[PDB]
A = this chain, B = another copy of it.
């Protein structure tokens, strides 16, 4: 049937529903108005391959990675001097998904198919954290040892 195991798998996920959030407090992000050459230097040393993009007013703009930056620099064949004069927002992936702080497990697992982590903003627009694929896979791995 696969509907009984789907119900048992869902109930177990609600047990770790609160431990899914990676808060913005300890979470490296970027500013949408810093230059692109500088963000290439920062992303070339950070641990994660994609980071959230916020502002001074902390409005969530989107996500960005070296893939998005290098694609902009390669597709348009732009030198390093032009990159130091180009804002990050012109290559920030803004057409991404997002969930409210009162997120449901069905939205999480569904939207986590397309992006590697799920941004958690507020009802106003303030970026507050992310839900990573790694966090969900930790719960899936904890189900096999019980």
Contact = CB atoms under 8 A, between A and B. Distances in A.
A3 to B, nearest CB: 4
A90 interface: no
A65 B44 contact: no
B143 A2 contact: yes
A7 B113 contact: no
A73 B137 CA distance: 31
A137 B146 contact: no
Interface string A31-74: 00000000011011110010000000000000001110011011
A144 B67 contact: no
Interface stretch (A22-30, A104-112, A122-130): A104-112
Q: What is the copy number of this chain in the assembly? A: 2
B8 A5 contact: yes
A9 B6 CA distance: 9
Interface of A: 2-10, 12, 40-41, 43-46, 49, 65-67, 70-71, 73-75, 105-106, 109-110, 112-113, 116, 133-134, 136-138, 140-146
Given A9-B9, A9-B143, A43-B70, 19 more contacts: A2-B12, A2-B143, A2-B146, A3-B146, A5-B143, A6-B143, A7-B146, A8-B9, A9-B140, A10-B143, A40-B74, A44-B71, A44-B74, A49-B65, A49-B67, A66-B67, A66-B70, A109-B144, A116-B116
